[PDB]
Amino acid sequence: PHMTRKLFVGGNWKMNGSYSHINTFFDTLQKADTDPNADIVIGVPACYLKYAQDKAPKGIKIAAENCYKVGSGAFTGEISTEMIKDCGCEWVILGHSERRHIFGESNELIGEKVKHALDSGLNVIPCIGELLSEREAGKTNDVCFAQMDAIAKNVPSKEAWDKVVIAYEPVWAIGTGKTATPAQAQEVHKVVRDWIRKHVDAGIADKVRILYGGSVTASNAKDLGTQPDVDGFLVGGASLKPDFITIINARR
Amino acid sequence: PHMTRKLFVGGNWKMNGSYSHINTFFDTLQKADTDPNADIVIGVPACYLKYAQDKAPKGIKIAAENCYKVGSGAFTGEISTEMIKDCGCEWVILGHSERRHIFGESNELIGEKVKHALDSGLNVIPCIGELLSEREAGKTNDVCFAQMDAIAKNVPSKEAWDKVVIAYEPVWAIGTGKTATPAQAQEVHKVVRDWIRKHVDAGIADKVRILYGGSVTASNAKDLGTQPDVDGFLVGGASLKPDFITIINARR
Ligand code: NA
Ligand code: NA
């Protein structure tokens, strides 16, 4: 169903976390039996990048939740690609709905960040997804296509897609409990994969992981994950809880 | 000239720094003879907060370069007041010109952040200052007054002003080499101090430190610092260099 696409389970702690929580959470994670064929990446606040990557069990990668679009400079409050690598980390989440819709990051800025992160040797999780008002207007695909256009035109090469994991999160499902049904997720992922097939490359479309995110839980992950164009999850609230282990083991 | 107001020397590394630079810089800082009657606070990228505060010599405080306006939650890419304290830090720079004019943070948002930081037990360095276009339009005081209004109405009590250090940085002086003259800095600081005297309290106006920032260097700091309403500096580019030591020792 998912061809040669390996399961990917992302977490995003958003603006939560502490040294105490990191110690406990990753002790539980190390003790637990997790699917050895899942890629696991957890986004954490920037002040915890190195500590959490040191404390993470082998195989688990830590992501920055954002970064800026140049290597260094006069950008108070920003985190650079080089600081992420200095902290021992290789992943960054880009274009999350909260950056776009609370902090006003544009498609152009997120595209610029995708290119700079890829050109710095980072792996990226670019986020796409539509507002409730956009879906009601019949613009779900239009919005996702414009977001994918900005991302895709900024992936510097065909090889670079090996370092890209797309996450689709309908904004109305993020933090609301109103999870997309397996049908709703599959429909959008198929449309996005077809877009990548047509506008980028058919080989790459077949290989690129596309995550569903937006109120993924331990009980709903299995049915979302068995959809053929859903390759895994980007988990918010539940990635702070032991439930994240169950979600990791959903395709097991 | 500066009454009972103690010298305050702030640094802002902006989007620069690394574990290697922190080690070297703070070895030089520990070895150097710094004015023992100066408060010294250095803003660093969030991924380095704990490390830099552990490595800083005694007496030197580390600041976050930004924070959000609530304690925790679904705010991808944000740093909270509680994470700053978890990293052993007590200071945050708020409303820096780069946040206002590159990342679109409004007066209302910066006011909300001042109140939340103060209500979390943090010390704050709220930043004010006018664009070149605003000074040419004759609006320098107007802009500073509106920014001070948002800050002042969000300082929860009279005691809380003990945890506030205002920094005035004309945007045209930040990173440009076009330092405000001692005259230009003194004129604005006097106007701002008078504003605090009239709109807040005369006691507080007498005690609150007001920093000048914007292309402060080792050679120009002395004359800026001897101005009676200039209580110290907020230093950008030069706080990455050994010159920061000379600036710290300018009022010596
Ligand atoms: Na580790
Ligand atoms: Na220390």
Side-chain angles (χ1 to χ4, degrees), chain A residues 1-3 5-29 32-36 38-54 56-57 59-138 140-157 160-177 179-186 188-189 191-197 199-206 208-252, chain B residues 1-3 5-29 32-36 38-54 56-57 59-138 140-157 160-177 179-186 188-189 191-197 199-206 208-252:
Chain A
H2 302 95
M3 305 179 49
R5 291 186 305 264
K6 173 177 190 192
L7 172 70
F8 187 110
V9 187
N12 180 9
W13 283 11
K14 306 197 180 180
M15 200 182 75
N16 299 271
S18 68
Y19 287 115
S20 147
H21 182 55
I22 287 160
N23 287 329
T24 297
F25 182 87
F26 284 112
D27 175 76
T28 299
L29 246 184
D33 173 36
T34 53
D35 189 332
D39 292 333
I40 304 166
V41 177
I42 305 171
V44 305
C47 50
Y48 300 124
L49 288 177
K50 161 159 208 292
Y51 189 84
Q53 187 58 96
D54 295 345
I60 295 201
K61 289 318 217 322
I62 296 306
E65 289 177 20
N66 199 17
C67 75
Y68 198 50
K69 75 178 167 158
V70 292
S72 62
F75 300 102
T76 295
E78 294 298 297
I79 299 304
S80 83
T81 49
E82 289 313 309
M83 300 168 188
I84 296 158
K85 289 157 58 169
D86 194 42
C87 299
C89 295
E90 313 167 41
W91 287 84
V92 58
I93 301 164
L94 289 177
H96 191 276
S97 158
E98 280 142 25
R99 301 312 309 178
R100 296 183 184 263
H101 302 293
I102 308 175
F103 298 97
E105 296 195 19
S106 67
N107 273 309
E108 167 177 34
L109 175 62
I110 291 145
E112 285 165 339
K113 294 177 170 200
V114 163
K115 177 185 166 44
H116 174 77
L118 287 173
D119 285 348
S120 315
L122 282 192
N123 300 274
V124 296
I125 302 161
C127 293
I128 66 173
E130 88 283 356
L131 299 163
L132 185 61
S133 60
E134 285 159 347
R135 167 170 293 252
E136 289 175 354
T140 293
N141 294 2
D142 284 347
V143 163
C144 289
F145 289 165
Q147 290 162 349
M148 281 305 299
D149 188 67
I151 293 160
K153 81 194 207 238
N154 274 293
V155 177
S157 80
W161 283 96
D162 290 337
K163 297 192 104 166
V164 172
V165 173
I166 303 297
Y168 166 68
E169 317 192 290
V171 181
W172 47 266
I174 293 172
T176 58
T179 319
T181 63
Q184 280 170 325
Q186 171 56 33
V188 170
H189 287 227
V191 165
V192 171
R193 200 179 299 278
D194 288 345
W195 187 97
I196 301 172
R197 186 175 313 282
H199 295 267
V200 183
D201 183 71
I204 284 159
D206 292 332
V208 64
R209 269 86 59 83
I210 312 183
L211 315 181
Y212 170 77
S215 300
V216 183
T217 74
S219 39
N220 66 29
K222 194 207 183 64
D223 290 327
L224 286 155
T226 64
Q227 297 307 296
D229 290 292
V230 177
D231 302 310
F233 319 107
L234 188 47
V235 183
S239 77
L240 289 168
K241 313 173 188 178
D243 308 44
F244 193 63
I245 292 158
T246 302
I247 292 167
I248 285 170
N249 289 327
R251 239 170 82 183
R252 231 174 164 186
Chain B
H2 302 95
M3 305 179 49
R5 291 186 305 264
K6 173 177 190 192
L7 172 70
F8 187 110
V9 187
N12 180 9
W13 283 11
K14 306 197 180 180
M15 200 182 75
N16 299 271
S18 68
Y19 287 115
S20 147
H21 182 55
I22 287 160
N23 287 329
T24 297
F25 182 87
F26 284 112
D27 175 76
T28 299
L29 246 184
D33 173 36
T34 53
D35 189 332
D39 292 333
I40 304 166
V41 177
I42 305 171
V44 305
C47 50
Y48 300 124
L49 288 177
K50 161 159 208 292
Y51 189 84
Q53 187 58 96
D54 295 345
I60 295 201
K61 289 318 217 322
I62 296 306
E65 289 177 20
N66 199 17
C67 75
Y68 198 50
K69 75 178 167 158
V70 292
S72 62
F75 300 102
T76 295
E78 294 298 297
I79 299 304
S80 83
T81 49
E82 289 313 309
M83 300 168 188
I84 296 158
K85 289 157 58 169
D86 194 42
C87 299
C89 295
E90 313 167 41
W91 287 84
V92 58
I93 301 164
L94 289 177
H96 191 276
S97 158
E98 280 142 25
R99 301 312 309 178
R100 296 183 184 263
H101 302 293
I102 308 175
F103 298 97
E105 296 195 19
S106 67
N107 273 309
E108 167 177 34
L109 175 62
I110 291 145
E112 285 165 339
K113 294 177 170 200
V114 163
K115 177 185 166 44
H116 174 77
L118 287 173
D119 285 348
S120 315
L122 282 192
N123 300 274
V124 296
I125 302 161
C127 293
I128 66 173
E130 88 283 356
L131 299 163
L132 185 61
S133 60
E134 285 159 347
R135 167 170 293 252
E136 289 175 354
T140 293
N141 294 2
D142 284 347
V143 163
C144 289
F145 289 165
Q147 290 162 349
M148 281 305 299
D149 188 67
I151 293 160
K153 81 194 207 238
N154 274 293
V155 177
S157 80
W161 283 96
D162 290 337
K163 297 192 104 166
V164 172
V165 173
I166 303 297
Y168 166 68
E169 317 192 290
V171 181
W172 47 266
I174 293 172
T176 58
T179 319
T181 63
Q184 280 170 325
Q186 171 56 33
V188 170
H189 287 227
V191 165
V192 171
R193 200 179 299 278
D194 288 345
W195 187 97
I196 301 172
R197 186 175 313 282
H199 295 267
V200 183
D201 183 71
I204 284 159
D206 292 332
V208 64
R209 269 86 59 83
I210 312 183
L211 315 181
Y212 170 77
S215 300
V216 183
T217 74
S219 39
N220 66 29
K222 194 207 183 64
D223 290 327
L224 286 155
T226 64
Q227 297 307 296
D229 290 292
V230 177
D231 302 310
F233 319 107
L234 188 47
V235 183
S239 77
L240 289 168
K241 313 173 188 178
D243 308 44
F244 193 63
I245 292 158
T246 302
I247 292 167
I248 285 170
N249 289 327
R251 239 170 82 183
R252 231 174 164 186

